[PDB]
Design a binder for these strands. Structure first.
Lengths: 297, 165, 299
DNA sequence: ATGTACAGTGACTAATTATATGTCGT
DNA sequence: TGTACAGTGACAAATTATCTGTCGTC
């Protein structure tokens, strides 16, 4: 009955194409969002080129339930602040069930055209692609929160959907610890620990707090595709995966780095290497054999 | 800190399948029958479902998935023989001596006879005692070096002075 | 109903204690058989120390389906003519697959025992330590046919037990070649082909027509424990297993060795080796170490 | 904080294409 | 039909951790 009872999870594919930092054409991202039933409030979002499998929804859960920390680059007016453990969740593999179970809320899986109507559908490259994925992250959290969430609802227009949701919480929305919500993260596995507790990830190099005790061992990683600047490392066991430490990206030139940016860095590094002509490096190979073809003992 | 369940066996999935059904909000007038309709598909008495939900709340998905016994990896030969085996192998592999487990077991036989112990450990136990030690001695061969990264570089002189390049 | 219509499996545990071919006590066997529920004759039968289980049941089922024969030391006056699949096999998951392979219904969840147990076995000197599982073959496989099945019951048409069988067919079974159902045999998961196609099994060595081409590869065996003097070698595919070769035990004194005898033969080697008075031999090891510990380094 | 770096690996993914399916057929 | 010992798989015997009953007031 009350707002915050059943949480809807929605998907769409954004008909705006993007360009990469170095000018490569990106795809069109999928948008996934978590919204109330009885308010129209938006409480969670993820956007990216990952297909709307269990991945983007598992992150969009994590997005909502934690405290909504935000950056200055967003130029936000409003604190989003929408923490709170859900209790029912509703979506279009099974992994969502394990999360719902472990977090103790029923998952009983089987409106975005508001942004199709809005000028959002007219930014460059809609429907010269002069925008990138980090720019969408900064602007879209703002243009949703400060404008599409804080405004008066389409019907029951006596309340803004945020405030209809905020007062309607059966008591007060309760945040919960961050580190227990790692199951919602991405996963990478069988990474190997180098001298001093070191790890490679996405062509970057990482180092841990106490990870040097397990050099030569192998470990799994989890991360957000929004800032890989520190990623969680866990020791694998037979039926338990135990969190060991954070590990910190090293040698990067910025305070923040999205996964898409590590892909772009690699893709520029890779695409540079692809342009080098082997013409000399190749012709010497047949000429070495044509010489050795004269050998007889 | 966080313990994550992974590689859940199918009977643990059955435990999950009841837990995900009991997750529907209920009360005493509803718990009892909505438990019993699970107990019949667990095919085991109600009190086990009580301990199941107890452990589920106590530990999560790693509560309903069984943990190996406290005895796993710990030997029953006891503290004296666990030491004597490992003592004897350890002294036999310093310097160029290369005493393998069999020669240790042959020492164990000699030791029990002179100790008047009528039940010396079998060579399979002695090999199982040393198997983790042997693996720790193996791992040391594999430990990788990260290497230098990017443009910045220096070289380690024996003067102790890192010469930037 | 018909003599090939409905066959029922049965089992018993024998009340006789056995000694090996040297003179040490082994155990009291398990015993199992199938009986045609139409004719009520005791046909396929297995005896041994391996306890009743799907492998033993399947082995006795081979002993029913396959045409029976005897060695030149028996040449017995009475013999089974039983062979072929039943329309239904009774023993009331592995037994489903043999039925699905051969095409007969598998059911699982009056018996004769007293005609042997009380009438014969209780009379033997070893009844429940001085006869052997080579001898307890004929002391069953003879009497079960030469007396029991040769007996007549007027309860079922006043004919010998097997005469009702061979009379009672709606169409007489053809014999089945041995090669058609190795699925009833034992299994060995891995064996390595040694040089020249040799293969060790049961402490013996085997060689066979084409096995040397598989040297340095791994093969599976299937074998009959009543005589391991032949073994069958199988090669595993992606999801099939193809009969590769027969193989024959090298260097045997007599071409009849059973699995039980090979174990007891190998247990002679084990007991002989274990007989060493090794306690006088340990003195080398402790005094060698004492000497080396007496050598302190020069610096 | 950082030995070196290439050949071989794994874990997918795009393209091929072998062949399972559902309907009609006689 | 090289030789053959130390290490290892599959299993049984023994130990013993712990989890399943029938139960008692809660």
């Amino acid at each position: 009955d009350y707002s915050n009872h059943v949480w809807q999870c929605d998907h769409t594919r954004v008909d705006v194409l993007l360009v990469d930092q170095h000018g490569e054409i990106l795809s069109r991202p999928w948008l996934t969002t978590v919204i109330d039933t009885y308010s129209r409030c938006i409480m969670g979002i993820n956007l990216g080129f990952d297909a709307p499998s269990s991945g983007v929804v598992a992150l969009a859960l994590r997005h909502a339930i934690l405290p909504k920390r935000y950056g200055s680059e967003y130029k936000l007016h409003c604190e989003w602040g929408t923490y709170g453990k859900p209790e029912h969740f509703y979506t279009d593999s099974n992994h969502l069930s394990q999360i719902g179970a472990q977090l103790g809320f029923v998952c009983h899986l089987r409106p975005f055209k508001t942004l199709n109507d809005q000028l959002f559908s007219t930014l460059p490259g809609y429907t010269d692609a002069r925008l990138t994925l980090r720019e969408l992250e900064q602007l879209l959290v703002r243009y949703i929160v400060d404008r599409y969430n804080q405004s008066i609802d389409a019907r029951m227009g006596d309340q803004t959907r945020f405030e209809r949701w905020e007062a309607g919480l059966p008591t007060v929305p309760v945040p919960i610890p961050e580190r227990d919500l790692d199951i919602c993260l991405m996963k990478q596995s069988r990474r190997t620990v180098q001298r001093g507790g070191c790890l490679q990830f996405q062509n970057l190099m990482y180092r841990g707090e106490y990870l040097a005790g397990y050099a030569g061992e192998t470990v799994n990683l989890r991360f957000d595709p929004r800032d890989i600047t520190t990623i969680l490392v866990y020791r694998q066991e037979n039926n338990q995966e135990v969190f060991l430490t954070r590990a910190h990206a090293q040698g990067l030139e910025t305070e923040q780095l999205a996964l898409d940016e590590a892909e772009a860095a690699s893709r520029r590094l890779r695409t540079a290497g692809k342009t080098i002509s082997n013409q000399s490096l190749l012709q010497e190979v047949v000429d070495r054999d044509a010489l050795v073809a004269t050998k007889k003992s | 800190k966080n313990v994550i369940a992974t590689q859940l066996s199918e009977e643990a999935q059955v435990k999950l399948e009841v837990i995900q059904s009991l997750l529907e909000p209920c009360d005493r007038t509803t718990y009892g029958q909505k438990l019993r309709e699970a107990a019949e598909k667990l095919n085991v008495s109600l009190r086990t479902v009580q301990r199941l939900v107890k452990n589920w709340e106590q530990d999560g998905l790693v509560g309903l998935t069984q943990t190996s016994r406290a005895d796993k990896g710990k030997h029953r030969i006891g503290e004296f023989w666990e030491n004597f085996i490992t003592k004897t192998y350890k002294e036999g592999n310093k310097g160029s001596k290369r005493m393998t487990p069999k020669q240790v077991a042959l020492r164990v036989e000699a030791k029990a006879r002179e100790l008047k112990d009528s039940k010396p450990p079998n060579y399979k136990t002695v090999l199982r005692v040393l198997a983790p030690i042997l693996e720790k001695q193996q791992k040391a061969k594999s430990i990788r070096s990260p290497g230098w990264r990017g443009t910045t570089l220096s070289v380690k002189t024996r003067e102790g002075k890192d010469l930037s390049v």
